Amino acid sequence: MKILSIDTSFSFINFSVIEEEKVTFLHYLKSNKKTLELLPKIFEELCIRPENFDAFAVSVGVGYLTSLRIGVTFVKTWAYTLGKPVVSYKNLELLAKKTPVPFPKIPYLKVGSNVFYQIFEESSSSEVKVFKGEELRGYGISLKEFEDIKLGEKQFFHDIFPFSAYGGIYAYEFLKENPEGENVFEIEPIYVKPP
Template identity: 45%
Template structure:
């Protein structure tokens, strides 16, 4: 099974390609141009055509709304046209899931000038919240440029890789994916 996982949530775009659970390719770069301009180049570089893909994984946030919508729309379209499953994943959840830290765990990411977090206590995943609203206690993880005072700081965290691993495990357990027409990015504030 070939799984393509895409993350367009921040200024870097990354894509991972897996075959039968093994990583074939991981491409990451800082996005100096618009996401829509970069995606065709990235996919050409990776050497994957949508018809060769058996399942898609896509980040739904947290992150910048326009790049998220562009990546999500691309994957939703491919999944719909090829009738292949699409598995959404959320970045804070991936950091909590794949960072070995003591419980409770707190993942923090910056979107524009605001910090957002999510917690995991070993049983339950909290909703995404702004950090200034009653900051949580626990072992914190983040990206260096987002929240450098965290206990565990990554220079980079390839969300597409961890999202792809998570999606692959979900598919193996029988998960059929989501209806692509209902997938939306994670909205961090109510509409105006």
């Protein structure tokens, strides 16, 4: 199976191809261009064609909401029209599961003025919260982009953590037991705050 996995959560937009359970392609670009300036021109430049894929994966964040809505719309449109499965994935979940620090794990990301974080235990997790300075117990996990922000008792910052790669590997695993994927009409960005 060959999966196209997309991530438009942040200005470091990235997409991956997953085959044989592993990443066979990843393109990652930090850009000040608008999301619609980059998509879908960046696919044409790299010869990425939606009909060449068996399945799709897309980040639902947390991330910048308008760029998430754009990326999710691209992917839902392709998956629905080609009759191919689609799998959504969550950035904060991936940051916790893939970082081998002790529990509790506090992945966090900054979107605009909000630091969103989520608290993971071995067998359970909290909702996505908004950070307000509180003293937190456990191990913060984030990106080098956000190195100036300290959550928890100690921090690990990933030099790079391309969500579309980890999300695509997850989607591959997901489709083994759930080959129909997730309902394409219901895929939407994660909304922490209301409008």
